[PDB]
């Protein structure tokens, strides 16, 4: 059942790119990932957390990219290299950021695993990023505060409130303020 | 001058009251305007949308309470310690509140703009005990998006309110913390 997951979020990850959030229906999914739609149900009940499930293995991918060693001197730069890697990867696919961002907004608590799962990662992946070997709880803290200075300005990106360079120039302003 | 004025006010009051008792849902401009006694018509001239009456209805409250510590640290402590209570003390209109700030778009872009400066100024300047640096305008905006992503966190039942209210007290120690 691993490889019909990996169909599901394999479909679910083209056609959110191709379409945004409108193009996810469970019944296109089910239909491009040739699985049964009670499969499809069984592992995702809602479209909500199939973009957010799909996120989260894209940031596990993320993350094994490279390694911790792969960079900068100080924890300014490296958190900075992160940010940087992730916020070019925003800037490249505009319609999978618009699904992702308008699935968040609509998690809610039957979907609470799936997000925190995603929150767990990718703070993760900013306190290693800050940190010499295990993160402190400080840089845990860090990273969630970076985390909603991006979810909220994708708020405002998303309404069309405000363009992604200012997203990009918000994260940075944040790390600086944070660590720099 | 003195009507549009009065006029003006009750809406705000109307839109407070409503939104405070019903939360997002309550707040209908037939409701708004009945309430606070103008036309539906008059209503729709001054605020096109319950967006723009709830973002215009808040920065009139943070006016209100901008009106009537010895570190930046303490002041913007005390200063989000006190607004956390006071949301504590109103869920429903927090509520409204969160939804309209989520649900806002371009056309109420200029809005949520104004109140924009107001908060953070009132932050910044709770930092400065006077007039705030660039970067103290910077740290208020960071606050202020924290805010909204744990109310957004706490809307979708994420998150509770005692969350929300550790991670701004977090935000405030990473941010000017002593």
Redesign the interface.
């Given at each position: 059942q691993r490889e019909r997951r990996k169909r599901i979020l394999d479909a679910t990850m083209a056609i959110a790119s191709k379409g945004g959030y409108e193009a996810v229906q469970m019944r296109a999914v089910a239909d491009r990932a040739d699985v049964a739609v009670g499969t499809l149900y069984r592992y995702f009940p809602s479209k909500v957390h199939l973009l957010v499930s799909a996120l989260g293995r894209e940031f596990s991918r993320i993350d094994a990219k490279t390694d911790r060693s792969a960079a900068g001197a100080t924890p300014f730069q490296r958190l900075n290299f992160m940010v940087g890697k992730l916020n070019r990867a925003m800037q490249r696919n505009p319609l999978l950021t618009e699904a992702m961002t308008r699935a968040y907004?609509?998690?809610?608590?039957s979907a609470?695993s799936e997000?925190d799962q995603v929150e767990k990662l990718i703070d993760s992946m900013f306190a290693r990023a800050m940190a010499n070997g295990e993160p402190t709880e400080?840089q845990y803290?860090?990273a969630?505060?970076i985390?909603?200075?991006w979810?909220?300005?994708l708020?405002a990106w998303l309404?069309?409130?405000a363009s992604a360079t200012d997203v990009s120039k918000?994260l940075d302003?944040?790390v600086r303020?944070?660590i720099g």
């Open positions: 907004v609509f998690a809610d608590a609470a997000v400080d803290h860090i969630r505060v985390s909603d200075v979810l909220s300005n708020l309404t069309r409130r918000r302003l944040a303020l944070l």
